[PDB]
Enzyme design. Structure first.
Site, PDB file in Angstrom:
ATOM      1  N   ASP A  19     -51.260 -65.138 -86.675  1.00  0.00           N
ATOM      2  CA  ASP A  19     -52.311 -64.315 -86.068  1.00  0.00           C
ATOM      3  C   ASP A  19     -52.253 -64.422 -84.535  1.00  0.00           C
ATOM      4  O   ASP A  19     -52.359 -63.420 -83.830  1.00  0.00           O
ATOM      5  CB  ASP A  19     -53.714 -64.745 -86.532  1.00  0.00           C
ATOM      6  CG  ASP A  19     -53.974 -64.448 -87.996  1.00  0.00           C
ATOM      7  OD1 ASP A  19     -53.473 -63.417 -88.497  1.00  0.00           O
ATOM      8  OD2 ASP A  19     -54.700 -65.239 -88.646  1.00  0.00           O
TER       9      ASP A  19
ATOM     10  N   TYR B 213     -60.665 -74.229 -90.485  1.00  0.00           N
ATOM     11  CA  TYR B 213     -60.799 -75.594 -89.975  1.00  0.00           C
ATOM     12  C   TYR B 213     -61.869 -76.376 -90.731  1.00  0.00           C
ATOM     13  O   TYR B 213     -61.717 -77.569 -90.954  1.00  0.00           O
ATOM     14  CB  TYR B 213     -61.120 -75.594 -88.486  1.00  0.00           C
ATOM     15  CG  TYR B 213     -60.036 -74.968 -87.646  1.00  0.00           C
ATOM     16  CD1 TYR B 213     -58.701 -75.343 -87.803  1.00  0.00           C
ATOM     17  CD2 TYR B 213     -60.339 -73.996 -86.701  1.00  0.00           C
ATOM     18  CE1 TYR B 213     -57.695 -74.756 -87.035  1.00  0.00           C
ATOM     19  CE2 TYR B 213     -59.347 -73.409 -85.931  1.00  0.00           C
ATOM     20  CZ  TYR B 213     -58.030 -73.791 -86.102  1.00  0.00           C
ATOM     21  OH  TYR B 213     -57.052 -73.200 -85.335  1.00  0.00           O
TER      22      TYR B 213
HETATM   23 FE   LIG Z   1     -57.280 -68.558 -83.653  1.00  0.00          FE
END
Ligand SMILES: [Fe+2]
Ligand SMILES: [Fe+2]
Ligand SMILES: [Fe+2]
Ligand SMILES: [Fe+2]
Ligand SMILES: [Hg+2]
Ligand SMILES: [Hg+2]
Ligand SMILES: [Hg+2]
Ligand SMILES: [Hg+2]
Ligand SMILES: [Hg+2]
Ligand SMILES: [Hg+2]
Ligand SMILES: [Hg+2]
Ligand SMILES: [Hg+2]
Ligand SMILES: [Hg+2]
Ligand SMILES: [Hg+2]
Ligand SMILES: [Hg+2]
Ligand SMILES: [Hg+2]
Ligand SMILES: [Hg+2]
Lengths: 340, 340
Positions: free
Chosen positions: A237, A122
């Site tokens: 994930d 991010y």
């Molecule tokens: Fe995550």
């Protein structure tokens, strides 16, 4: 009463998942529940690095977007960042002190680790699209619309962590602390853990997936393709993380692990159900703040709201809860292109 | 009082490494100490999968070893398995609740995660050289000589964890718990943390390297080539870990971080010295057991003791402590080719 290396020689195949003797030796040649070893191996095979993804064009894409779309994209990214900030540390601090079998301990650490990679991703995205990343990160802690959810999530963890400390320090019973009575019940701690796991499952099964819809809606228009590539990896994930929480929850209620837990699973069946609905409702109300200044191609309040009910119905049934919404097929099957 | 997501918007660049406001947002675009971001990136670039290393010939080599050499090899491996079992969970349980800057929080989680990979590698080795791994793993817990060598490690962590819980639950001051007076001093907790870090530094800088020498002594005669490949990768990670601890300790001593930590470091100077000397003695006392059934050419009690004194002086010098042992040249220069 917590120890980093229990000196008692015990059979790790006979311990319950939680509240048994703390784990001493970390071994992987055998496991009580194979699923956690399989999850560790899969997660390791999925190791990726954010820096390897080209996000050089996301800058111009973001700049060309109308103001209300910039808002949708950034608000969603801020929420994803918040979720992984909490998930990168909480499983470790909250679960590690209570796990009694090695495969689950290492799975929890591996899971938490994979979340720090998401957080790193991010930052990679944010710094390549705004000029002054600091504005984005500060708004995460103070954004009123966002902080309601964080507060509720952080709360379960914080409360479990607190009760665990008391249990480790004082043990079960009725104690006195500075003139106040403090009651420590293992049964209540077990309930706390169960509800916390259910909350993390909802965070995994619903909160993240609703955010994926928003991210991929941009990808469908061939916008923010750098971001889309990263979210696709994160989604892969999360699918493993959700598989892990679903198995923990079902193993605990099937009476296979700890009998007292199966008992508790049945006991708070109604509370668990409301917890899930509440989460769905929060993501719904959020869609309001999201499209306050307008919608976009492929996404709007109603479609997003429909996806929430769809996904929630599936997740709740996966953990043995009744369906809260009207059954229907996937409102946005195009998302399957980016998920599993 | 501990929280998984503090709601106060704080300048993370101004918080101390430890004991400040718990970290909320996980960001990596800026850091108070760039060294930790560098360490995270390095560790991530070193990612490796143990089961990928071929250890099929190790089985043949091991069986071909005379009994006393099997004793040497397996005893050393059992100790390494113990150290990494503790290091996979301890940094997270003991340090995470006290860290107040994001780069350090993520480094600790990354460091701990790399230790679980090390544990996974020992299983890969053990499972491929012996018929019943359970005999090896079970002996790690019960073996009195292994626990005497490692004595003090889990103890320090457990004491820190307990003191930390008291601090998060009661806060600073003198309290009454079940009719007993319990004192909670932040300064005393800072001392506990500081000495815990110095202990981990000795574990990373000395205990692990003494074990590497024993492993590589076999690679020197072209035996246990698989284990050697693994130990080389593990040693590469430990070098990063010790760099991290040396930096934490030296930053604290500088007074550039929490000024109180600089005072504590100076005041606890003799204790730091005493634990390094104690750790060194424990490693030497281990030689009696390691070579009880006989030694090897180039690897015996005398050489091990010379090496321990050699590396201890180097490590203590790196963190500003006086040297306990007489200076000497490397007694086993052949290790250099195996390390870094
Ligand atoms: Fe995550
Ligand atoms: Fe996740
Ligand atoms: Fe290690
Ligand atoms: Fe290490
Ligand atoms: Hg939880
Ligand atoms: Hg939770
Ligand atoms: Hg969204
Ligand atoms: Hg959405
Ligand atoms: Hg429940
Ligand atoms: Hg339930
Ligand atoms: Hg709806
Ligand atoms: Hg420590
Ligand atoms: Hg320690
Ligand atoms: Hg050794
Ligand atoms: Hg040695
Ligand atoms: Hg010192
Ligand atoms: Hg010596």
């Amino acid at each position: 009463a917590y120890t980093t290396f229990s000196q008692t020689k015990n059979d790790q195949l006979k311990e319950p998942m939680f509240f048994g003797q703390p784990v001493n030796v970390a071994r992987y040649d055998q496991q009580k529940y194979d699923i956690f070893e399989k999850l560790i191996e899969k997660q390791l095979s999925f190791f990726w690095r954010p820096e390897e993804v080209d996000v050089s064009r996301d800058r111009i894409d973001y700049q060309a977007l109308p103001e209300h779309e910039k808002h949708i994209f950034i608000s969603n990214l801020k929420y994803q960042t918040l979720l992984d900030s909490i998930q990168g540390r909480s499983p470790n601090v909250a679960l590690l002190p209570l796990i009694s079998i090695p495969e689950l301990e290492t799975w929890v650490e591996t899971w938490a680790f994979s979340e720090t990679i998401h957080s790193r991703s991010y930052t990679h995205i944010i710094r390549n699209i705004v000029n002054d990343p600091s504005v984005v990160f500060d708004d995460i802690v103070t954004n009123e619309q966002i902080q309601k959810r964080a507060e509720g999530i952080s709360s379960y963890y914080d409360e479990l962590i607190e009760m665990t400390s008391y249990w480790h320090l004082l043990g079960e019973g009725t104690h006195t602390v500075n003139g106040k009575t403090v009651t420590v019940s293992l049964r209540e701690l077990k309930k706390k853990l169960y509800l916390c796991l259910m909350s993390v499952n909802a965070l995994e099964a619903i909160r993240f997936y609703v955010s994926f819809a928003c991210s991929f809606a941009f990808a469908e228009r061939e916008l923010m393709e750098g971001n889309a590539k990263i979210i696709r990896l994160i989604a892969r994930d999360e699918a493993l993380h959700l598989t892990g929480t679903q198995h923990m929850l079902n193993l605990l209620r099937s009476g296979a692990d700890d009998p007292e837990m199966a008992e508790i699973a049945e006991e708070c069946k109604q509370e668990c159900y409301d917890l899930f609905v509440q989460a769905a409702q929060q993501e719904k109300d959020w869609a309001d703040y999201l499209f306050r200044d307008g919608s976009m191609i492929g996404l709007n309040k109603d479609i997003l709201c429909q996806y929430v009910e769809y996904i929630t119905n599936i997740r709740m049934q996966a953990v043995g809860l009744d369906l809260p919404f009207n059954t229907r097929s996937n409102p946005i099957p195009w998302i399957n292109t980016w998920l599993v």
